[PDB]
Amino acid sequence: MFVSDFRKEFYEVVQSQRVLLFVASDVDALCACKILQALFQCDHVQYTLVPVSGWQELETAFLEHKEQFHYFILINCGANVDLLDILQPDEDTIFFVCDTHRPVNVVNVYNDTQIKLLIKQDDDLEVPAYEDIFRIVEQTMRRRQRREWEARRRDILFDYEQYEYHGTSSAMVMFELAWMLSKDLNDMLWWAIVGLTDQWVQDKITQMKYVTDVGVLQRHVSRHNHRNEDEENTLSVDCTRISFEYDLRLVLYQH
Amino acid sequence: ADEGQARKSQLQRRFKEFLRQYRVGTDRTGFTFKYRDELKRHYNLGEYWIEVEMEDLASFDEDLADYLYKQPAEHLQLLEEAAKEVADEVTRPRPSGEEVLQDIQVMLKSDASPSSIRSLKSDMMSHLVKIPGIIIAASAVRAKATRISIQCRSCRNTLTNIAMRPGLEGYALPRKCNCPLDPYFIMPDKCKCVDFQTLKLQELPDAVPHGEMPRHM
Numbered sequence: 001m002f003v004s005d006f007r008k009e010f011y012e013v014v015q016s017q018r019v020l021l022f023v024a025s026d027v028d029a030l031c032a033c034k035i036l037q038a039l040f041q042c043d044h045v046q047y048t049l050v051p052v053s054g055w056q057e058l059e060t061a062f063l064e065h066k067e068q069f070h071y072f073i074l075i076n077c078g079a080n081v082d083l084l085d086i087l088q089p090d091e092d093t094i095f096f097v098c099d100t101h102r103p104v105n106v107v108n109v110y111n112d113t114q115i116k117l118l119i120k121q122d123d124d125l126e127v128p129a130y131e132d133i134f135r136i137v138e139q140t141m142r143r144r145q146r147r148e149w150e151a152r153r154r155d156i157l158f159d160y161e162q163y164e165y166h167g168t169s170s171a172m173v174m175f176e177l178a179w180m181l182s183k184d185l186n187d188m189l190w191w192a193i194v195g196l197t198d199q200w201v202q203d204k205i206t207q208m209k210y211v212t213d214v215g216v217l218q219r220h221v222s223r224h225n226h227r228n229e230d231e232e233n234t235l236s237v238d239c240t241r242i243s244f245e246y247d248l249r250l251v252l253y254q255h
Numbered sequence: 256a257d258e259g260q261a262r263k264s265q266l267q268r269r270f271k272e273f274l275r276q277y278r279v280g281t282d283r284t285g286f287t288f289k290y291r292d293e294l295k296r297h298y299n300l301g302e303y304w305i306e307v308e309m310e311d312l313a314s315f316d317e318d319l320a321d322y323l324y325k326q327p328a329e330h331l332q333l334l335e336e337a338a339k340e341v342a343d344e345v346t347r348p349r350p351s352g353e354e355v356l357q358d359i360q361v362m363l364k365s366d367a368s369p370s371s372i373r374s375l376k377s378d379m380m381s382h383l384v385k386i387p388g389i390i391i392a393a394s395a396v397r398a399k400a401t402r403i404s405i406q407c408r409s410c411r412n413t414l415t416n417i418a419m420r421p422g423l424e425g426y427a428l429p430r431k432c433n434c435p436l437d438p439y440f441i442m443p444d445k446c447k448c449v450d451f452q453t454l455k456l457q458e459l460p461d462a463v464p465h466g467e468m469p470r471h472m
């Protein structure tokens with residue numbers, strides 16, 4: 001399914017439980033974890049952090065922990081494939097996915113019990129409608145039409161799952177969540193900025209989308225750091241300050 | 256002339272606020288005053304020297320760490336005269352046996368790429384340089400008068416507290432006593448002295464352009 005609001009559907013369910021966090025290995029996912037951590041250590045929510053690196057290790061990890069816990073969270077892993085089969089879970093287990101990969105697999109979208117998605121649907125998504133891809137002579141006369149339906153399905157799949165790309169970074173969804181609760185700080189803003197900058201560094205998003213997201217984040221940066229308008233002389237020098245720069249493209253030139 | 260000391264009394268005050276305020280460490284863990292603590296812990300042991308780092312000086316006040324690269328002679332003095340006014344408000348009251356404030360030799364290191372002896376063109380005259388090498392010699396330590404006092408010969412007039420300049424440069428004794436032409440001699444009883452050596456630095460072996468004997472400084 002698609003989570004409509006993150007407060008009352010994702011957070012305030014796992015708020016009183018013992019969750020298990022699977023984490024991929026990329027700067028985007030690291031910065032998307034380090035905010036969720038700080039959002040759990042603030043409300044005394046027992047979590048557990050398992051660093052995975054592939055599908056074999058994710059399966060091995062799900063093998064051992066799949067009876068103690070019955071909540072799960074996957075971060076930048078498992079939104080472009082099908083989930084209810086590679087893991088083969090039980091019925092009363094819940095999965096949250098907060099991945100960037102695209103496009104989201106089909107069944108993961110029409111499965112509104114076990115695989116919830118924290119993906120803001122206002123991204124570049126065009127998921128096919130429901131029945132377009134999911135289920136005497138008159139018998140054959142109509143089962144030929146169902147065969148036509150299957151033939152259309154074999155094509156619309158090839159239409160939809162042919163190009164892979166990336167949406168808004170995880171460390172921005174998590175930051176939207178952490179701002180809703182009114183528990184955002186600078187330290188949770190720097191990790192948002194880094195988790196965004198990393199995609200543009202590794203060239204997985206378009207310059208248009210990058211500048212749009214920078215335009216978003218600058219309002220937050222100014223909301224936090226502008227409150228020190230003229231008191232920048234009586235603020236402690238040992239306290240982080242984030243600033244917007246129009247700066248060179250040379251790599252690491254300051255060191 | 257009159258703006259000279261008025262600038263200095265404003266530099267010797269910004270070099271003092273650097274030692275007195277520069278901290279390290281973040282806000283999550285906890286901080287540490289880096290140079291007050293070393294001044295105190297080196298004074299109480301009886302060492303009298305700190306090791307200021309140029310990156311810190313740059314990151315605190317950007318103008319000072321530039322003057323220090325351009326006019327190191329007449330600014331190291333202000334630095335070493337502020338290190339002495341900070342080491343006073345940190346260790347006092349000194350217990351019993353010492354109550355005269357010593358003098359703090361401010362060394363300084365850096366993390367910057369080194370030049371080489373073959374790259375000392377005359378446009379680098381009186382600029383901080385940073386060169387590697389290999390010690391090749393070592394003189395025996397000697398004295399070097401720092402604060403000297405003279406006396407006339409005939410009329411026995413004194414003119415004391417005269418301060419020598421550092422480095423290898425002497426002093427020009429007057430000839431106008433206010434007595435014969437040069438009536439002034441040195442009073443050996445009243446002249447503070449400090450040690451000084453003189454080494455000899457040879458250039459690294461893997462940087463000779465390979466036709467000759469390495470040069471030294």
Ligand SMILES: [Zn+2]
Nearest residue numbers: 407410432434
């Ligand atoms: Zn005389």
